[PDB]
Amino acid sequence: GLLDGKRILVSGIITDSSIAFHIARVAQEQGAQLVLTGFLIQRITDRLPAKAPLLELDVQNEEHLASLAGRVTEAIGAGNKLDGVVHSIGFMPQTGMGINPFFDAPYADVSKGIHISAYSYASMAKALLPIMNPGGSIVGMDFDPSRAMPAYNWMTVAKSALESVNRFVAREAGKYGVRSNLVAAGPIRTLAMSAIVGGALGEEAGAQIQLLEEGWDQRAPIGWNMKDATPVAKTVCALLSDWLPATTGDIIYADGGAHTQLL
Amino acid sequence: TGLLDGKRILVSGIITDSSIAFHIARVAQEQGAQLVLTGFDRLRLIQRITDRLPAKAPLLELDVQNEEHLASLAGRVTEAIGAGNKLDGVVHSIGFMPQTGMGINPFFDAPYADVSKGIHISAYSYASMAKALLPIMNPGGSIVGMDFDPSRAMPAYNWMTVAKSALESVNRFVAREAGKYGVRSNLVAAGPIRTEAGAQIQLLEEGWDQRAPIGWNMKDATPVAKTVCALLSDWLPATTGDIIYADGGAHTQLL
Amino acid sequence: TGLLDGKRILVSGIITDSSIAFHIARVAQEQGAQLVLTGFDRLRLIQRITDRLPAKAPLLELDVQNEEHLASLAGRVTEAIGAGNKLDGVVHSIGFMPQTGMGINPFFDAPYADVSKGIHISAYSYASMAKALLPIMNPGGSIVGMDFDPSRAMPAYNWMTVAKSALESVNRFVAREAGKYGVRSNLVAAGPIRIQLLEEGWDQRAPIGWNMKDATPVAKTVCALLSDWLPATTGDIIYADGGAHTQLL
Amino acid sequence: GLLDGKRILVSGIITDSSIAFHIARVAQEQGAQLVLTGFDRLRLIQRITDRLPAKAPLLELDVQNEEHLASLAGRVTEAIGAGNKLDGVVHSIGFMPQTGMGINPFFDAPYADVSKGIHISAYSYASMAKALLPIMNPGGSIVGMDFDPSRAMPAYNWMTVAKSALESVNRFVAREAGKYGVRSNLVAAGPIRTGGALGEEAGAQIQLLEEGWDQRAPIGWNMKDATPVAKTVCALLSDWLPATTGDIIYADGGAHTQLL
């Protein structure tokens, strides 16, 4: 097992199509002992290979964050610490992402999306670093925001902020001998993405997303399967392992290499 | 016979005569531009400072966090420049982050309300200003924002770095919208300007002049102001959604 | 009143009137610069092309692979501009890659002799020209090279893309040397100037559009870098590509 | 082990301080079966590779020799057995004459020397991939060694230019490798001590470059230790980064993500 004996916190499980669900499944297959967070979820988490305690965590709730380390210690047992943390939380209201014009997103919506998608990566690291072992690893989920694109809109801005937050989290994490990195994935057909392909956002957005995904598989030298999240989950586990011990404040691209090719 | 002869340019962000916006404004006027200035909160203080500029320019109130100020902005600019006239340039020179998110305070101790305020003013407002002003901008027009390279983390800058990373992303989307009006949108990434953390910030500033192949004078905003004017001119007509580094070339050198 | 009034600028790379160097030279003359031109191999043909320019400018021979041409260059430029005068600007607009390293030919089938020739002319020569000309450059001066964004691989450009990646690296080291003379060194990364799908994709991604038949926006960008308006920019790349490189789709 | 049953070719062993020596050692500790390639000092390389955990066949390979490249796949097949293919290829070759790297002014490097350095350090990555892709299994991995050339630095000079060319070559090699279901990536390492031989000026510049790394790296950087770099190469040779290609993984203590 790649993660044999490691105690890992995994956030962001909502459905069995969430990348966190696949990260947690592979982490358990690789011998990790998990602690899960959520804010209904118990039903979904019961579908994982092994039973894991589920803790309540609303990242926008400061009381949940202040009590988190103590609640995790209770779940893993006094004297034990975490070796890993997976931040797999991302949100942007429909005004800031999708069909809505970029200029029509109110700041209250954009701010909510940035709180959950970017700032919470620092919040979780602040709460959990005091109960992390040296050699530990914090991993977040990204979508390459280096270039603008249709529809992603203000979520592109939140991902750009997340990448910046990750570099500062690495500075803090380093004091504990802990690494902090992001996995930039290619398009993933989740419960939300499938509906857009299904035409829930209209024919215009449906065509734009179809062109975005078809372009990915053709640019990716090894191809890209938007229905298979496993290569992304394995990449997160590689960062949670001891096999990338000199990588921190960084971004690993699990995108079929699409970002390295123009056409 | 100036670089910006006949151009109507809005310049936001003048607070003191050491503000980058003050030099941008002085250089633009020396190069024959007609200006419209915007000010936040300290309006009477801004009026006295703008009295030191080469030519008189109308001063308009603009709080970027105020939606009413943004909805009325185009109308108020049109009144100032005259009906039938449009802007050829827009300078966004606004940046703010509370002390909890910038300086000596630990990165982890910044409350989100403070970070959100700083991101609103420093990054989101670039889209707000472009939304308000694009309907009154001429083709061939130029929107310029002020940046500080956030590609790498650094001591003390903390959440302001995060806000600059957001700004660069906003700029790329603003360019998509601006292009529909034949308008460019770009940022000028400047080197440090003198407008435990103290020692780290001092080493950051000294390191700039040594890495910069042409050197860097942190007491001189003029090279930065000239760079903004180059982007406001017709001399970079195929550049948009981009970043021009007026940093002495420091970002291109490791040591 | 021109942007480059009184400036003495060397412009290399004119072969045809469609050369980016030709439009750089035309715009710089329109803007009051006094030019010195350099040409390679087909000198009688280059002279004819340079007669199309607004003003007469001396044409000097320069084969960047010829060490004797490089060792005599400063002396020959000084003869053309007059003793006691120095250059304020240098434009490197030279690029070459044999057909084995560029086009339909498989990436793996390019012999190293061909790749080496292309890298010599397209990348190393930027350092060669700066070495020869910085001793005859004025403070506040500007060296500009022509680039095509090589950050990502693409079909057909193959080994030329590798040569552009080398050029960008060379430019950063040339800036270190140039700075000692108070001189800037930068590249202009242009969009395509007239594979078809690559070129059509450019105008659609560019927020302000891209006209591949028009070299003027690129020529103006080079002149902006030759002017005194970007005095704190060096070892850098300015993108005159309609902003295509900042957009995914 | 991480690389159990995998057949991996490792080039670039010259001394027991070569990053390739450590790559080979970690790969063997992790169950890989190796084929080694050596240049010029073959008898000397044998003495070094006798210091590895297990015995591995050593093949001669001069990357500037087109005959060595044309016969390479056949010679590898003989060493691993007919019907078997490689799952991994490690390019750990770098060279630049002293005229292009060190104390010598950047402008004083003759092109013949720069060209030789680019041939060995950048072009040979495409040469090795061309020779070995026909004898590589799907899911396979090609890894090369890099040093971040995004910014200019003192003394590295023309070797930085060669690394910038290598990164570009890697992106094109990924296009070709993808047709075989093979990944191609580079590992950008921090400085590794592989005295005053360059004088006081260069010595001070190089010392400041190296000390700056450990201070910028949030997890620190041990320039005497190649193991974190060797483990990173093995992570890319494994099946744990299956959607990464034409890319660069930084095993530099995170120094490149920090300004100061």
Ligand SMILES: NC(=O)c1ccc[n+]([C@@H]2O[C@H](COP(=O)([O-])OP(=O)(O)OC[C@H]3O[C@@H](n4cnc5c(N)ncnc54)[C@H](O)[C@@H]3O)[C@@H](O)[C@H]2O)c1
């Ligand atoms: N000073 C430097 O070292 C430096 C370096 C690189 C970039 N920059 C950038 O240049 C720009 C100008 O900074 P400066 O150096 O002139 O400092 P500054 O203090 O003079 O400018 C910041 C301006 O933001 C304005 N502002 C704040 N809140 C506002 C609000 N609610 N609505 C409207 N305006 C508001 C202030 O009134 C002030 O004029 C900023 O974006 C800054 O990040 C500065």
Ligand SMILES: NC(=O)c1ccc[n+]([C@@H]2O[C@H](COP(=O)([O-])OP(=O)(O)OC[C@H]3O[C@@H](n4cnc5c(N)ncnc54)[C@H](O)[C@@H]3O)[C@@H](O)[C@H]2O)c1
């Ligand atoms: N055309 C485009 O799409 C495009 C795009 C971006 C950048 N550029 C770059 O702009 C530059 C000029 O290219 P262009 O498109 O104007 O084409 P071009 O064919 O007109 O220019 C290439 C020039 O290089 C010269 N040259 C070749 N070998 C030489 C040698 N041994 N010594 C000296 N000069 C030599 C040729 O004589 C010619 O004048 C090149 O660096 C090219 O890569 C072109």
Ligand SMILES: NC(=O)c1ccc[n+]([C@@H]2O[C@H](COP(=O)([O-])OP(=O)(O)OC[C@H]3O[C@@H](n4cnc5c(N)ncnc54)[C@H](O)[C@@H]3O)[C@@H](O)[C@H]2O)c1
């Ligand atoms: N040492 C460091 O600080 C450091 C840092 C980052 C990256 N790297 C890279 O790691 C790689 C390995 O270098 P190293 O540090 O182990 O030094 P090294 O000297 O031990 O390895 C370089 C190898 O290249 C081989 N070589 C040279 N010319 C050759 C030719 N014509 N044909 C075949 N092989 C040839 C040599 O025999 C030698 O084994 C290089 O690509 C280097 O740039 C090293």
Ligand SMILES: CC/C(C)=C1\OC(=O)[C@H](C)[C@H](O)[C@H](Cc2cccnc2)NC(=O)[C@@H](NC(=O)c2ncccc2O)[C@@H](C)OC1=O
């Ligand atoms: C513009 C089209 C829409 C409507 C979305 O964008 C996508 O689906 C893009 C094209 C990609 O498929 C990405 C791929 C991805 C998926 C999960 C984590 N990182 C990246 N999805 C999200 O960013 C999606 N992110 C997540 O589901 C998410 N999940 C866990 C952790 C971080 C996340 O960003 C989500 C925000 O994106 C979308 O909804």
